[PDB]
Design an enzyme around this catalytic site. Structure first.
Site, PDB file in Angstrom:
ATOM      1  N   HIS A  40      44.291 -98.615 -36.602  1.00 49.38           N
ATOM      2  CA  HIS A  40      43.046 -98.446 -37.347  1.00 49.38           C
ATOM      3  C   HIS A  40      42.554 -99.677 -38.080  1.00 49.38           C
ATOM      4  CE1 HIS A  40      46.353 -97.096 -40.014  1.00 49.38           C
ATOM      5  NE2 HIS A  40      45.735 -97.913 -40.858  1.00 49.38           N
ATOM      6  N   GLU A  71      49.480 -95.673 -32.376  1.00 46.78           N
ATOM      7  CA  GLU A  71      48.912 -96.205 -33.607  1.00 46.78           C
ATOM      8  C   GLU A  71      49.252 -97.648 -33.969  1.00 46.78           C
ATOM      9  OE1 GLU A  71      46.609 -94.288 -34.744  1.00 46.78           O
ATOM     10  OE2 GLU A  71      45.939 -95.780 -36.250  1.00 46.78           O
ATOM     11  N   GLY A 145      45.703 -98.104 -48.310  1.00 43.38           N
ATOM     12  CA  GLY A 145      45.958 -99.505 -48.622  1.00 43.38           C
ATOM     13  C   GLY A 145      47.372 -99.986 -48.306  1.00 43.38           C
ATOM     14  N   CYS A 147      48.807 -99.161 -45.444  1.00 45.22           N
ATOM     15  CA  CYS A 147      48.978 -99.241 -44.006  1.00 45.22           C
ATOM     16  C   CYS A 147      49.238-100.679 -43.561  1.00 45.22           C
ATOM     17  CB  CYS A 147      47.795 -98.592 -43.292  1.00 45.22           C
ATOM     18  SG  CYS A 147      47.852 -96.763 -43.392  1.00 45.22           S
TER      19      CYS A 147
END
Ligand SMILES: *[C@@H](CC(C)=O)[C@H](C[C@@H]1CCNC1=O)NC(=O)[C@H](CC(C)C)NC(=O)[C@H](CNC(=O)C(C)(C)C)NC(=O)OCc1ccccc1
Length: 180
Positions: A40, A71, A145, A147
């Protein structure tokens, strides 16, 4: 304690703070000019690495044999310096440990570490509405935040933080074969 000491040294040598148009993330360099970001982070043609523009020559959104989301996005940076090779710290399969630390390095969380304890191979997870696999789970109240944060134990880099809620957090397993 051993996990923390390992984490601090690893972050000092291989991590950086990166900004894409979608946010600010902790980024871990793996070998040569290849690094990893949560998927992401959606890196575009250039990123800001430690406040300096860096071109992205290639970016691969990882998926398994059946197209299921993992991911993670692998990116090759247009830069001369090479990352210290940390592939020997990456396992061949999902690791489970009794004591892990999650390390974050951004403007919002500057060199911060969280003792997340036990890590279990969670596996399947509908993440943010997207079926995802190879998830590692730990109980701790994580936050937006975080990640890109690096999940580690003594001598092991287990994965990259990609989601959570309530008091559970999940990392995508960072496997050795993703880098050959
Ligand atoms: C890091 C990325 C950013 C932009 O900071 C966050 C970290 C998590 C925020 C909540 N606690 C965290 O540690 N990642 C996201 O916000 C993450 C994004 C995806 C994969 C692009 N989404 C989630 O973390 C997570 C997904 N769903 C679940 O975990 C459950 C338990 C519901 C299956 N949940 C979440 O973000 O809130 C619920 C949600 C919001 C929007 C769409 C779908 C679910």
């Amino acid at each position: 304690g051993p996990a923390f000491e390992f984490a601090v040294a690893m972050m000092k040598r291989n991590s950086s703070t990166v900004k894409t148009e979608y946010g600010e993330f902790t980024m871990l360099g793996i070998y040569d000019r290849w690094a990893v970001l949560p998927r992401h982070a959606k890196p575009g043609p250039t990123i800001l690495m430690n406040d300096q523009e860096v071109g992205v020559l290639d970016a691969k959104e990882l998926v398994d044999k059946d197209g299921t989301n993992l991911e993670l996005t692998l990116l090759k940076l247009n830069r001369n310096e090479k990352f210290r090779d940390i592939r020997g710290f990456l396992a061949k399969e999902e690791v489970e440990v009794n004591e892990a630390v999650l390390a974050i390095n951004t403007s919002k969380f500057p060199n911060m570490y969280i003792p997340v304890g036990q890590v279990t191979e969670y596996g399947f997870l509908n993440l943010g509405g997207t079926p995802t696999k190879r998830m590692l789970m730990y109980n701790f109240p994580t936050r937006a935040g975080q990640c890109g944060g690096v999940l580690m134990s003594t001598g092991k880099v287990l994965g990259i933080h990609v989601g959570g809620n309530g008091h559970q957090g999940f990392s995508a397993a960072l496997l050795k074969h993703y880098f050959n």
